[PDB]
């Protein structure tokens, strides 16, 4: 048994809308298994595709397929969400169909922040954007105010926001959001451990690639060696998670526990004023 009263209270206080980037080839292979595992824990779940689907209730964006249209799907998805859902949630998560999210830990992190604060969160990378951008795979989450500025202020200005549908989806949104004064939040826990991860847990717990010019060690905004220390007790996301591994993470995180070791929740910080972030780590 579990007492989930605290997490049910945050469910209603911190509404998270989760949108999942997918394509028809992945509808049954991947997207389905996101819906059956972590997806159903979101306040609102939306599959953003190029074609409709009964099972997912998928939204067909007016955007072709291929890696060359991911940026066009991101733009159309946030436009759609602004059009139809901007008052349906406080926070707007973009994830892939190989992202795994512990939604309860996301609400924990977001609790203090005003949805009216222009900010987004994720795994922060250094290149192409002065204030950093967030890994598309690890998932990144925008405030209501961040989604407003994106759709109302960035998209209509080609100088601020790339108008072609080509490019790294996560770099491009990073640029649009810096250009409309949306802050790149710090998603690390109060001990400085990461919460958003672009790889599976093993790859962060046991880094095999050893600072050998591998892109990750050059991209990471906050310097860390990772290892057994890498990862918060309230980590939020992992990526390159296989459909089967979605169900295993669900089992080991939500179900399996060592008898007589009771997780005691850290106290919730006090709510912040509009425009204010937590003290830096």
């Amino acid at each position: 048994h579990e007492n989930s009263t605290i997490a049910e209270r945050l469910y209603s206080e911190v509404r998270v809308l989760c949108w999942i980037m997918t394509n028809p080839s992945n509808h049954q292979k991947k997207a389905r298994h996101v819906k059956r595992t972590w997806g159903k824990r979101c306040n609102k779940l939306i599959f953003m595709s190029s074609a409709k689907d009964d099972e997912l209730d998928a939204v067909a964006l007016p955007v072709g397929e291929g890696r060359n249209n991911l940026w066009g799907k991101t733009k159309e998805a946030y436009k759609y969400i602004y059009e139809h859902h901007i008052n349906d949630a406080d926070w707007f998560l973009k994830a892939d169909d190989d992202t795994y999210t512990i939604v309860e830990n996301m609400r924990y992190m977001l609790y203090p922040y005003s949805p009216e604060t222009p900010v987004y969160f994720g795994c922060k990378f250094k290149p192409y954007v002065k204030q950093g951008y967030m890994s598309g795979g690890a998932g990144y989450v925008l405030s209501r105010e961040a989604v407003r500025r994106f759709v109302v202020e960035a998209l209509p200005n080609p100088k601020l926001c790339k108008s072609d549908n080509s490019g790294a989806e996560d770099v491009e949104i990073g640029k649009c959001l810096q250009n409309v004064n949306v802050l790149a939040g710090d998603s690390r826990d109060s001990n400085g451990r990461g919460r958003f991860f672009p790889f599976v847990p093993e790859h962060h717990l046991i880094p095999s690639h050893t600072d050998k010019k591998f892109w990750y060690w050059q991209y990471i905004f906050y310097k860390t060696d990772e290892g057994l220390d890498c990862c918060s007790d309230n980590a939020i996301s992992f990526h390159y998670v296989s459909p089967n591994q979605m169900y295993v993470l669900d089992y080991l995180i939500y179900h399996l526990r060592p008898y007589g070791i009771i997780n005691t929740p850290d106290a919730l910080p006090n709510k912040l004023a509009v425009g204010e972030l937590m003290p830096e780590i």
Binding site: F199, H203, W215, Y216, Y219, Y240
Partner: peptide, 5 residues
């Protein structure tokens, strides 16, 4: 470039 595992 792409940046994979």
């Amino acid at each position: 470039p792409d940046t994979r595992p």
